Specification:
metal-binding (chains A, B); 2 domains; DNA-binding transcription factor binding (chains A, B); Recoverin, domain 1; Helix Hairpins; two-stranded antiparallel ribbon; homodimer; calcium channel regulator activity (chains A, B); 8 helices; calcium ion binding (chains A, B); signaling receptor binding (chains A, B); mainly alpha
């Protein structure tokens, strides 16, 4: 029985489940209660990806630009989500980063994947957060790399200002 | 009336609130339903702050250290709050960072303020996340800063791998 594995994984010593255990039991079974918004951190990264003014806010044009990009990434995610699990394999995030063409080493790409991995899988929220953060940091690095050297001279305060803003 | 402000903020043009509105109204007024855990991001940062071998996991010795550091930062947060509301203004954040030993410029503090403050102020979670990220980023910078010059030349691949992991 397919459901028994989900049951036994949360069941107590009495061989039964209570409300809390049922909540976790139903979720992994495939029955969700509803949709949840993006994490606050993910939204903050989005704002910092598109804020040219450095006001910590976003205008309407930039929002349109964000929606189109998010919908594009969602369509790619749904395409790879085989069983509507809401998660994809860590290897699949590695490919997405590579396809961005920011030119990262395999040792960098894989270590990035590791951080956004929850029990050997990456969620939709983490997939987007990782993608958004990579882009915003790359743009920040490029704004400073005026000679196009691939190297940036970072004074401590400028480094803190740069990374803490993203 | 002291309570009127919280009411009118969520009330419709009828002077009446529903259950959804009462939820947001009661929290602002000074009555919370309970405690919530740290955001997953804040916890991810904490693991990253004490990770010595890129494991992405934490041992017990490191956990004991974390708890002491957190309890210390908590104790300082409550002495600034003086309202038990669990929220603090940017000015009291600038004071808190200086005490821990941060030589950050007002410009850097401003960028932190724009990232972690909503509707005017910063939560305890964002306060902690900010502290954790600053310590870990300062450590990353410091370890690349040969002869204590306060300047680091960052290659792109190392910059990304470094900051994405924290």
């Amino acid at each position: 029985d397919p459901l028994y594995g989900y049951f036994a994984a949360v069941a107590g010593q009495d061989g039964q489940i209570d409300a809390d255990e049922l909540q976790r039991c139903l979720t992994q079974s495939g029955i969700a209660g509803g949709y949840k918004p993006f994490n606050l951190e993910t939204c903050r990264l989005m704002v910092s990806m598109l804020d040219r003014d450095m006001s910590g806010t976003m205008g309407f044009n930039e929002f349109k630009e964000l929606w189109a990009v998010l919908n594009g990434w969602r369509q790619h995610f749904i395409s790879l989500d085989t069983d509507r699990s809401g998660t994809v394999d860590p290897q699949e995030l590695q490919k997405a980063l590579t396809t961005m063409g920011f030119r990262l080493s395999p040792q960098a790409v894989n270590s990035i994947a590791k951080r956004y991995s929850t029990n050997g899988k990456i969620t939709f929220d983490d997939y987007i957060a990782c993608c958004v953060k990579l882009r915003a940091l790359t743009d920040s690095f490029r704004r400073r790399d005026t000679a196009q050297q691939g190297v940036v001279n970072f004074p401590y305060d400028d480094f803190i200002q740069c990374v803490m803003s993203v």
